[PDB]
Amino acid sequence: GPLGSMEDFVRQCFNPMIVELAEKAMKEYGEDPKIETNKFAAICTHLEVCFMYSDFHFIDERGESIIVESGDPNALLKHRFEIIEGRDRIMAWTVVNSICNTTGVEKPKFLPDLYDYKENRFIEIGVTRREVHIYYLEKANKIKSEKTHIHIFSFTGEEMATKADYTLDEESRARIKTRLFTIRQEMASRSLWDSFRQSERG
Ligand SMILES: Oc1cc(-c2ccc(F)cc2)c(-c2ccc(F)cc2)nc1O
Ligand SMILES: [Mg+2]
Ligand SMILES: [Mn+2]
Ligand SMILES: [Mn+2]
48 lines ligand 1 (CB under 6 A): no
Q: How far is the CA of 68 from the centre of ligand 4 (A)?
A: 25
Ligand 1 pocket test: pick from 10, 43, 51 the residue with the most ligand atoms within 8 Å of its Cβ. 43
Number of helices and strands in the chain (H, E): 7, 8
Resolution (A): 1.7
CB 176 within 8 A of CB 53: yes
Residue nearest to atom 9 of ligand 1 (CA): 39
The H or E element that residue 123 is part of is: strand 121-128
Nearest to 37 by CA among 152, 196, 164, 189: 196
Q: How many Å apart are CA 83 and CA 39, to the nearest integer?
A: 21
Q: How far is the CA of 134 from the centre of ligand 4 (A)?
A: 15
Q: Quick one: which ligand is closest to 25's CA?
A: 1
The torsion defined by the Cα of 75, 81, 84 and 85, in degrees rounded to 10, comes to -110
Query: Per DSSP, what are the bridge partners of residue 125?
Result: 151
How are beta strands 78-79 and 57-59 bridged, if at all? antiparallel
PDB experimental method:
X-ray
Q: How many Å apart are CA 51 and CA 59, to the nearest integer?
A: 17
CB 46 within 8 A of CB 53: no
Q: How far is the CA of 87 from the centre of ligand 2 (A)?
A: 7
82 lines ligand 1 (CB under 6 A): no
Which atom belonging to ligand 1 lies closest to the Cα atom of 126?
1
42 lines ligand 1 (CB under 6 A): yes
Q: How far is the CA of 75 from the centre of ligand 2 (A)?
A: 30
Q: How far is CA 155 from the centre of its chain?
A: 13
Q: How many Å apart are CA 77 and CA 151, to the nearest integer?
A: 25
| Residues annotated catalytic, as ranges | 85, 113, 139
85 lines ligand 1 (CB under 6 A): yes
Buried b (16+ CB within 10 A) or exposed e, 51-74: bbbbebbbbeeeeeeeeeeeeeee
Q: How many Å apart are CA 178 and CA 165, to the nearest integer?
A: 20
CB 44 within 8 A of CB 18: yes
